[PDB]
Design a protein around this ligand. Structure first.
Ligand code: PE0
Ligand code: PE0
Ligand code: PE0
Ligand code: PE0
Ligand code: PE0
Ligand code: PE0
Ligand code: ZN
Ligand code: ZN
Ligand code: ZN
Ligand code: ZN
Ligand code: ZN
Ligand code: ZN
Lengths: 163, 163, 163, 163, 163, 163
């Protein structure tokens, strides 16, 4: 068996989102990014000549990205945000008493503590493994999945899981 | 006299901002972009061997970009937004009755009608001409200034002025 | 009224095709390219804040590209190819008596003389104007349409029409 | 001894080829790509200050690429193609009875089963090791050779050998 | 007749040179750049399907670049450098009495006043027109030649001539 | 604890320098490059949501690059250069008796043997670890630091240290 490593990356694996960083003793102003996601994996070349079909990887990266795209990214588990439900909005109050309010539908609530590149990457890695399907990955012999998320062209975080 | 056209462009001429599009009968969800700005100009090669020093162009593009960077871009002259001052926030109400509220300090109020790439480009062109200084441009023989703004790598608007 | 120039470009505006160059006294071997298409246009900024919506330009460039993608590009009007219909294939005979045969369904017959970048560009420009629709372009005030086609990252042809 | 990893990559390490994918129960239409090859290696920094001279790596990557460039890539060992020699052409018949015919000189016969990126990568890795020369690599202390092949900017396969 | 505009550009159209800027009241320290050159032209599509063959443009841009590559660029006509021939070296004395000495063979003497991007561009434009040959350009119907030179990815000068 | 790998890279992490290669039996002519530096590291995601703040990495890469930028890179420990102090210049004599002279202030003396990409990379890795501060790195849980230096877009050397 011959090992190969596949990489899929594209301006199309994008989610254009608003966010702000907040942690103890610090709060950034509201802003946004064209986040970009690449996926790298490793398996054996199968009898059909692929480790896994690029088209499927492109399809599922696109799908995960599309869920986040055009939303404010709202961390569910932050210890420094007070997140209130007010009518059809989320009202967010910070430790410096700064206050924000967005329509709930404008927000994507993600099970992370900080809208950092690192934590977004871990979330996307887990979602990608679910969307492509872990049993399907194993039928193709894939044993390594790795996600890189960039906030901008100049700063990236990369996380992996051995499967 | 020999004409030359200068172009300055960089991942550094960036402003990472939140915005949303709204015009009659339409409203986008809140999101954001890594906007990128390039500047192109035309003049004669001067006795010092430059049309104008690249370093100055880089300095002033950086300065304009830095004013917008890390803010929500708020159009001053929109006919479809109701912009209210509430304590230290701007409260924005849309035609579909969607409601947003941001700290005023998180916002940059710009004299445009829509936070589109085109209108942002016209604004930045005017600001760049002021920052570099129109008389200084004319001492260097510059007769054309042109700004390109990209919302993402795949979509750009370009505006110019003959000076 | 303020003029703006819009550019849309992307790794997504691609057609991955086979072709070969043939003209009098010359014939290239069969090969292929990831062709890439960009579109540039000029009009006035409309009351909605756009010259024309980027999404529409992306949609129609994608559509034209998709018709050509994954096919052998077969020039209809070449003076140096003998193109024969044999069962469900096109058989192509060159001036040096070289012979090719492809399933007709693997081929896209294009009303050009040479599968050059220049002639492909003129064809795509005409198709893009039809797909976006010339009357619709004029309602948005667009007066200039320009297509760039690249055979590879290092060689491009650009054609335009004043409308 | 200090380890260093060298990477050579360029738009010049290209082969612009036609191909089609075929495996059991599937056949793509004829098309093509600007394939691109990068080479990465690891060794110790030698007394001359190089692990190995970049110029040699560039020379040999260029040479391998040039053998494939401007040809139809024909897999020698496919279990789903019937490859016939007819006069000075190869006639290829697929499982769905689709038929192709190319001049033999337009084709490069490669000892692979599928013209996939993965299998092309393994072939190029083996050829690069022969062209640079395995004993010469070992005199420079190189212990790792790795090839990345891209079908297009957005999809790549990477293979390696420990030497 | 249909007009087309051709562009050739590549990491290969490079000259990696040392230089320093000097003009009245100013002198930069010795340093260097990977200069990059692109060529754009305009003519009619000819009966062979090309305005002019890309391969020729690539060949001649390469040739001009190769003459400059791996040398110190020495302006022949500077009003602020004292250039002395000392044995087999050029000794250069600046207005601040700074002194440099290089082997003559390490230098390329260019008929410019300043080693600026603008003046280098004008020189390369003139050399490219000579290398491709002005009569040959006119037989292909080319009526516009334009050169862009970049000192680094972020700063470029563009010059043209109507022929 | 979750591991993440951070990458910072930018056209801004540049030093535009002159140099020449010399080793036993060989000497290159004087020339230069836009060198580019990227930094990759690995640690655990901290309670603030970062492995380490990108801004600090960008700040210190910039600082190291700025020390080298706009200078001739002069290796301190070369066995094939005779480096003489003459008034306020360094005079360099090669094994073929070629002679150079530069103002000392135009030169950066680096504790390397060859101005190769590999040795420059090892030097920059060591300097980056000092500038960011090794104890500070360990408080953020960083256990791996890796530097890539490119002489041009097409040739790179990568070195690392486990900390
Ligand atoms: N490490 C790290 N640093 C950052 N700095 C600023 C903004 N975001 C980030 C981020 O997401 N991760
Ligand atoms: N023309 C144009 N179209 C757009 N489409 C979507 C988002 N922004 C825009 C934009 O800013 N300009
Ligand atoms: N001008 C031009 N030259 C070319 N050279 C080789 C292949 N294609 C082309 C092409 O399409 N156009
Ligand atoms: N994994 C993989 N997938 C593909 N999908 C489509 C075309 N080629 C390929 C290919 O070469 N490899
Ligand atoms: N306009 C211009 N400005 C510059 N600034 C610094 C170095 N070179 C240059 C240069 O070549 N041209
Ligand atoms: N490996 C290596 N090869 C080179 N070849 C030419 C110039 N520099 C280099 C260099 O710095 N490293
Ligand atoms: Zn951010
Ligand atoms: Zn937007
Ligand atoms: Zn071709
Ligand atoms: Zn293919
Ligand atoms: Zn310089
Ligand atoms: Zn060098």
């Amino acid at each position: 068996d011959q090992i190969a490593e596949l990489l899929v990356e594209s301006p199309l694996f994008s989610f254009n989102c608003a966010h702000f960083i907040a942690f103890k003793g610090f709060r950034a102003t509201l802003h946004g990014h064209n986040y970009n996601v690449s996926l790298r994996l490793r398996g054996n070349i199968q009898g059909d000549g692929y480790v896994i079909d690029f088209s499927i990887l492109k399809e599922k990266v696109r799908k995960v990205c599309k869920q986040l795209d055009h939303h404010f990214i709202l961390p569910m588990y932050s210890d420094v945000l007070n997140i209130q439900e007010v009518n059809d909005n989320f009202k967010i109050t910070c430790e410096d008493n700064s206050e924000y309010s967005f329509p709930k539908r404008d927000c994507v609530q993600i099970p992370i503590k900080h809208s950092s590149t690192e934590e977004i990457g871990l979330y996307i890695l887990n979602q990608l493994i679910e969307e492509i399907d872990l049993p399907f990955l194993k039928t193709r012999s894939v044993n390594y999945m790795e996600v890189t998320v960039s906030e901008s062209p100049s700063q990236k975080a990369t996380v992996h899981r051995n499967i």
